[PDB]
């Protein structure tokens, strides 16, 4: 037997840094398999400068799309980027970056 599910959603992977700006940055990830019924809510992106322990939300509300765009962020700074899977169960694993941002724009030359 069985109803409704329980637990959160299985976290999110394939998280890396897609690209990156001078304040702003872009987060590419991938959706769950575990999901069952219910249904994933979103995600919630939380950014912790470095030297700082407080994680703070880069999106007030959890995204819907497997991918978001965090703004206002000092340029060359090391902040780490980590993505909470969030649903009825509450929150997921963060899929911490396996790598800190140091937050620049830099495009080509020499074409």
Known sequence: ???????????????TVEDVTDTTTTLKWRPPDRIGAGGIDGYLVEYCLEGSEEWVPANKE???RC??????????????????????????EPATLLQP?????????SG
């Not at 037997?1 to 998280?15: E, F, I, K, V, W």
């Not at 991918?67 to 997921?92: C, E, M, Q, Y």
Request: charged residues 15%.
């Open 67 to 92: 991918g978001f765009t965090v703004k206002d962020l000092p340029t060359g700074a090391r902040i780490l980027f980590r993505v909470v899977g969030v649903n009825i169960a509450g929150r997921s």
């Open 101 to 109: 941002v140091t937050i620049r724009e830099s495009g080509p030359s």
């Open 1 to 15: 037997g069985s109803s409704g599910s329980s637990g959160p959603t299985s976290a999110p992977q394939h998280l």
């Open 62 to 64: 959890p995204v819907e």
